[PDB]
Amino acid sequence: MATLEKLMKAFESLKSF
């Protein structure tokens, strides 16, 4: 299900900080 598909870039962009 591509519902929270953004969490990946979100999170990795979060991993960033």
Swiss-Prot record:
What are the boundaries of the region Sufficient for interaction with TPR?
3-13
Tissues expressing the protein: Expressed in the brain cortex (at protein level). Widely expressed with the highest level of expression in the brain (nerve fibers, varicosities, and nerve endings). In the brain, the regions where it can be mainly found are the cerebellar cortex, the neocortex, the striatum, and the hippocampal formation.
- Modification type N6-acetyllysine: residues: 9
Describe, as the record does, how this protein assembles with itself and its partners. Answer: Interacts with PFN1. Interacts through its N-terminus with PRPF40A. Interacts with PQBP1. Interacts with SETD2. Interacts with SH3GLB1. Interacts with SYVN. Interacts with TPR; the interaction is inhibited by forms of Huntingtin with expanded polyglutamine stretch. Interacts with ZDHHC13 (via ANK repeats). Interacts with ZDHHC17 (via ANK repeats). Interacts with F8A1/F8A2/F8A3. Found in a complex with F8A1/F8A2/F8A3, HTT and RAB5A; mediates the recruitment of HTT by RAB5A.
Q: Which disease is it linked to?
A: Huntington disease: A neurodegenerative disorder characterized by involuntary movements (chorea), general motor impairment, psychiatric disorders and dementia. Onset of the disease occurs usually in the third or fourth decade of life. Onset and clinical course depend on the degree of poly-Gln repeat expansion, longer expansions resulting in earlier onset and more severe clinical manifestations. Neuropathology of Huntington disease displays a distinctive pattern with loss of neurons, especially in the caudate and putamen. Lopes-Maciel-Rodan syndrome: An autosomal recessive neurodevelopmental disorder characterized by developmental regression in infancy, delayed psychomotor development, severe intellectual disability, and cerebral and cerebellar atrophy. Additional features include swallowing problems, dystonia, bradykinesia, and continuous manual stereotypies without chorea. Some patients manifest seizures.
- What does the record say about domains? The N-terminal Gln-rich and Pro-rich domain has great conformational flexibility and is likely to exist in a fluctuating equilibrium of alpha-helical, random coil, and extended conformations.
Name the family the entry cites: Belongs to the huntingtin family.
What this protein is called in its record is: Huntingtin
What organism is recorded for this protein?
Answer: Homo sapiens
Mapped onto the parent protein, the portion here is 1 to 17 of 3142
